[PDB]
Design a protein around this ligand. Structure first.
Ligand code: BEF
Ligand SMILES: [Mn+2]
Length: 118
């Protein structure tokens, strides 16, 4: 399975990539919202892990745009942890929303759960 990891912070992207590589997934990365949409179109990932505070296009906009044409599972991963943040992310099309800092093991389990019901 292929996972697109969207995060502008390289250290965070690297940690998620390492953990997804350990699960046997193929990993593709994007460091801003524009790169996220370009990688989504070129790579057709099975699941997207999506940061929200991104340069060029924010994660909420990326999710809304992707949802116009695809039902690909989206797991938002952000430091934005308010009730409004989680509700808006889910209402715009996210299948899950995990807050930073996060557990690598829980992330793996949620990606598995999402792939299970998608
Ligand atoms: F910058 Be991500 F929204 F944590
Ligand atoms: Mn960010």
């Amino acid at each position: 399975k292929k996972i697109l990891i969207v995060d502008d912070e390289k250290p965070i992207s690297d940690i998620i990539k390492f953990n997804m590589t350990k699960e046997g997934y193929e990993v593709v990365t994007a460091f801003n919202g524009r790169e996220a949409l370009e990688q989504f179109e070129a790579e057709q990932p099975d699941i997207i892990i999506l940061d929200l505070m991104l340069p060029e296009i924010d994660g909420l906009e990326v999710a809304k745009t992707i949802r116009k044409t695809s039902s690909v599972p989206i797991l938002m991963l952000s430091a934005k942890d308010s009730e409004f943040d989680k509700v808006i992310g889910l209402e715009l099309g996210a299948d899950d929303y995990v807050t930073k800092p996060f557990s690598n093991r829980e992330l793996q389990a949620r990606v598995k759960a999402l792939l299970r019901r998608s």
